[model samples]
Target: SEIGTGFPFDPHYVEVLGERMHYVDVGPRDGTPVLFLHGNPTSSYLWRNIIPHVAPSHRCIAPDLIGMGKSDKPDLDYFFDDHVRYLDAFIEALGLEEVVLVIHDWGSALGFHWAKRNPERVKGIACMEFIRPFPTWDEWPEFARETFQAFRTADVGRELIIDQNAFIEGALPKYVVRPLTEVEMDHYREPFLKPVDREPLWRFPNELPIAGEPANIVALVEAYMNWLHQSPVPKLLFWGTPGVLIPPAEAARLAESLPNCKTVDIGPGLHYLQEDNPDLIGSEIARWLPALHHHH
Candidate 1:
């Protein structure tokens, strides 16, 4: 089926944990594989603009995590546990190895969690717009603190995210630098039309390991932060100006935690930096890959 606007790759699916998982697998077979993962209120369509530049020289793999995008939406609640289970199964089912992971938002959390568990499989990481565990709510900026607070609370969250579909319809557009065209909006909007289908979006903010709500995910973040602190794996942290998550100062601080981490300010972008700076994102990784020892 035709997907996205002039999207180049063929859509492929694999069975994982009894669910049909969808992914775009393109680029040369022998080239180094780079996995691009998206997070809340988004899908692999997030990578459409960035993939072509990477695909010319590397194997580009982007997946729709179980309940989101074209992947199967089971009757489950779309919790963090469900996402990780499906992601683990997707990686195992494909037997992906020596991978460079590019992650954003919740994808960052999932990528860190997976890489910590199976570091041998990971080659490196390119990260943007993700938060590591905050020791306390006081650590977050006032904007983030108030925003997440609204999400976790019952009436406000359900009204904005679930009932009104604000996560995609409102939050997605509000955060990006350029307003999304109708086609782009349709690509994101079509997947979660029904209120029931929007369950995953509703669950993400609430599931965030903030204010110690989900103790287990917080543990995972803490555990992964410890692993990242010591991990020899090279990492690239992309930062943007006036962004929603991981502003310039936070980016600098996070860089200090990793042994071999580099920070790049991609210029005047926001939380959904991909929308504003896909070429910068793609070209930077391309330029860095040659210097990376892990690139095959």
Candidate 2:
């Protein structure tokens, strides 16, 4: 199945919430487990190129969030808490401890929330483009604001995301800098083949806590952010020029506010920075892991 995906590892599965959760578990068993998480339209496949760099020295565990990637799609709402609950349980199920987290997109939100609740178990965080508790949606560019609004509106969301697969077919290609090969595009499109399959894809955007709407999500996002403000865990934030979610301005603000955060300019990328800077991203995390605890 290595058509265009850099992913070559054998798939591993674990039982979580009475369903099979697919993950790629590679490297030495005794080494500190570095958990890789993908979000929304992406899956463990997103980390294929990045994992090998870290895999040689650590246990790299990349999981497909339930209903995305190869994981089972149950009849559920696919809300924020649903993801958080499944992720938390998946971690416990693996009995992973003293972990290093490598996160992207909504994976950042899930990773941080877990790191917040279970601080003692987390060793460090290597974060890329991800969700944050931004003060307001107005801060975003007009394109981002309008696109997200379109995705969030129920009827529009179903039409665009579910029926049309605008996220996978439309926006994904546009987001990445290097043009994706046909094989790569089809590989990504494999998961959301049917309209019903896109339930999670459609539901994900609606979970965004924006402009003080969606009270519970806003509270959850803001709640975990308290930990980001105070936690002393080593954080390596990789942001790119003219990027989405983690734009340089936001990265600078994060570096200023979040304790133990070190920002790196990956340069020349957008929302799907992993596709643009996988080698750099993977190598940097590999380099940082040894120095993580030493810095403090």
Candidate 3:
């Protein structure tokens, strides 16, 4: 496998839970392991710019979650719960322990589940864009009630609305405050080249929030929420206001529940915040990582 900080990993793909999971295992064997998880439509490439900073000192791991990246695009059933379940296997396969987690979008939801289920394993977190589970309604966006309802209420709309590839690909450049070079844009769109290649991509938006009465993703969201609200652990939130789905108050509300969580205002970028702000991402995480990897 081309697993290293400098080289883009030729990840080893394996059948962990169900589908083939692709992951990068890099850095020193004894170094503290930091797992960098990308959200929907993105592979480990999302962390390509950020990993070099941490991989030298820590074992940085990134996975192309089941349906995305180089992993097998099985014609399998897709759901948020499926994402978490596969992640659990990734951890088990690698036997990761006492790590720092960097999360965004759908990754935020998965991070909460892993942290809550295995608090001892998670050292700390750097949350960006997405909101982790907590006991606060303030985090819910003003239009979330309506938007989430639209997604949850209308089945056909939910399936088609969220996974429109051209729209998602189009929005990537906007996330970065700076203009993306055509090469960079191509890199972002490399994985999901076809409509048939969008099972997980389509399922992510609708499966989120998992509030009120959810049909498919309810139990998964609720379980993570219960764990997040009740757990006494440290978390950090880096909120990008310009082009993000999560409002700043959502992080603030999350801080209320996870009081140890540190909330910071990261300028530039939006949902694909890392694309524009790798420097901020690396440096900010540098501040919190030492604490997160205390055992090492």
How far does residue 160 in candidate 2 sit from its true spot (Å)? 0.4
Candidate 2 collision pairs: none
Clashes in model 3: which pairs? none
- The global Cα lDDT (0 to 1) of model 2 is 0.85
TM-score of each: 0.94, 0.95, 0.82
Instruction: Tell me the tens digit of each residue's lDDT in model 2 across 8-111.
Output: 98999999899889999999887679999998789988888889899888899999999989899898999878999899889999998779999987898899
Model 1, TM vs. native? 0.94
Candidates in order have lDDT scores of 0.85, 0.85, 0.68
RMSD (CA, Å), each prediction: 2.9, 2.2, 4.5
Residue-level lDDT of model 3, residues 56-82, one tens digit each, is 777888888888877877776577767
Better of 1 and 3 by TM-score: 1
Task: List pairs with backbone clashes in candidate 1.
Answer: none
lDDT of 3 at 293: 53
Alpha-carbon lDDT of model 3: 0.68
The list of candidate 1 runs beyond 4 A from truth reads 1-6, 293-296
Instruction: Find the 10 residues in a row with the least total lDDT in model 3.
Output: 1-10
Q: Write down the TM-score for model 2.
A: 0.95
